[PDB]
């Protein structure tokens, strides 16, 4: 994360969760890197427990997340001279969206009594709508690049850790240690316990 703090001009921890300055000594497990672009002030909608438009039918966050989001502004790469209508978002749905999953389905949503055979008729509309992005637009219409990082902790061994590998094991000394991110203090002796490989 040290190089990533200066690779991009992103917002410096406008979120609640893991300690920002201590992120070197975090051996997290099973991240899910999701990248998408939004419009205007929809960054505040991506919050744990927040109720809105994107947070209700597009991407919902649970009460416990053990993480936060990373966002930055990009009005050049996501905007062209002509109309840039390459992004679509769903606002119509039959019911609520369960978190931690995506339900992609291009289906006709009905509002009246009569149904429709996949035809946008009188009371039948479509959930997907485009994003209006232009370089001359204001702050409330600029395309914002938002990526979410989840840092849940599991009992499985951590495949990622900070570069803090040094020193050596010391035996029969009541010394402090931070093995696998767990702080403790005690002697380091041997025993007759038989340990399975897993």
């Amino acid at each position, epitope marked *: 994360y040290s190089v990533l703090y200066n690779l991009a001009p992103f917002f410096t921890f406008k979120c609640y969760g893991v300690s920002p300055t201590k992120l070197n000594d975090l051996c997290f497990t099973n991240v899910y890197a999701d990248s998408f672009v939004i419009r205007g002030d929809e960054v505040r909608q991506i919050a744990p427990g927040q109720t809105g438009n994107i947070a209700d039918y597009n991407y919902k966050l649970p009460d416990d997340f053990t993480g936060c989001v990373i966002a930055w502004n990009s009005n050049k790469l996501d905007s062209k001279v002509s109309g840039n209508y390459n992004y679509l978002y769903r606002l119509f749905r039959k019911s609520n969206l369960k978190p931690f999953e995506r339900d992609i389905s291009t289906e006709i949503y009905q509002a009246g009594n009569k149904p429709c055979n*996949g035809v*946008a008729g009188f009371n039948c509309y479509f959930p997907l709508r485009s994003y209006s992005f232009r370089p001359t637009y204001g702050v409330g219409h600029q395309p914002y690049r938002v990526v979410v990082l989840s840092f849940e902790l599991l009992h499985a061994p951590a495949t990622v850790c900070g570069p803090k590998k040094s020193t050596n094991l010391v035996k029969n000394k009541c010394v402090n240690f931070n093995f696998n991110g767990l702080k403790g203090t005690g002697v380091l002796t041997e025993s007759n316990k038989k340990f399975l490989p897993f």
Partner: antibody, heavy 132, light 113 residues
Framework: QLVESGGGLVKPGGSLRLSCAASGFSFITYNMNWVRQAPGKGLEWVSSISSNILSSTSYIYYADSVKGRFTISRDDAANSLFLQMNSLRVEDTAQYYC???????????????????????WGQGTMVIVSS | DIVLTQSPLSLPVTPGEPASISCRSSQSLLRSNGYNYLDWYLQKPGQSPHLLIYLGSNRASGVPDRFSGSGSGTDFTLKISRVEAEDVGVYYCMQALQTPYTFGQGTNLEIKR
């Protein structure tokens, strides 16, 4: 559709490339079809292609002539569509309209038949001649 | 395929009186859940064709209310309240099946001024 590219004095033994140039418009998530006109009274549908967003397969719907000597290829990156002809047996005059299919959903459509609602975005600017 | 016959293809029409145009489909189109699989197309000569009525007996694409189409079974027609100088353009008929689509024969629409 605001402007179209292609159309010129091309021999029947050559290759024909036709395309539509677009602007800010829901082009990526819409099915695309081609319509050409005869100098006499009457038209005929020539080609159509679906989108990759709604389904993985392209939903190829062709008549006999366009299986004979036509092909299509999308891009899924910009607002354009490329139409390529490997051979030209008999094609004297054509307008090659760029009409839009008024259907955002697909249902009960197999590889044989699929309903179409209407068209409202016909485009002019492609004129092909083989008079040499 | 499907053949389309336009019986009133050549007729002089005067402003102020309704005009009717009919098309016939070879195959039956009764397989419908309340949505008639037929629509009409208007081709303005010179710039671009336009859409008047889409699938079903409804209105879309900003069509004026003077255009009205209806039909159920072996009967199809289009009703106009009054033709004007902006109504110059040939008409076509279409059904929403038989993916090798074929247009009908073109009209002329010579308004009798």
């Amino acid at each position: 559709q605001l402007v179209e590219s292609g159309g010129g004095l091309v021999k029947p033994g050559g290759s024909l490339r036709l395309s539509c140039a677009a602007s800010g418009f829901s082009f990526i998530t819409y099915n695309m079809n081609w319509v050409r006109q005869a100098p006499g009274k009457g038209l005929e549908w020539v080609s159509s292609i679906s989108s990759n967003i709604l389904s993985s397969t392209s939903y190829i719907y062709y008549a006999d002539s366009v299986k004979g000597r036509f092909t299509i290829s999308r891009d899924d990156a910009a607002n354009s569509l490329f139409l390529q002809m490997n051979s030209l047996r008999v094609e004297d005059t054509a307008q090659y309209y760029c009409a839009r299919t008024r259907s955002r959903s697909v249902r009960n459509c197999t590889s044989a038949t699929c309903p179409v609602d209407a068209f409202d975005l016909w485009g002019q600017g492609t004129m092909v001649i083989v008079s040499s | 395929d499907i053949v389309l016959t336009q019986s009133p293809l050549s007729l002089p029409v005067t402003p102020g009186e309704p005009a009717s145009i009919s098309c016939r489909s070879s195959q039956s189109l009764l397989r419908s859940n309340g949505y008639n699989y037929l629509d009409w197309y208007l081709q303005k000569p010179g710039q671009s064709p336009h859409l008047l009525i889409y699938l079903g007996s409804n209105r879309a694409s900003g069509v004026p209310d003077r255009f009205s189409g209806s039909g159920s079974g072996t009967d199809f027609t289009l009703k106009i309240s009054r033709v004007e100088a902006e109504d110059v353009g040939v008409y076509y008929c279409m059904q929403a099946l038989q993916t090798p689509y074929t247009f009908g024969q073109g009209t002329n629409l010579e308004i009798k001024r």
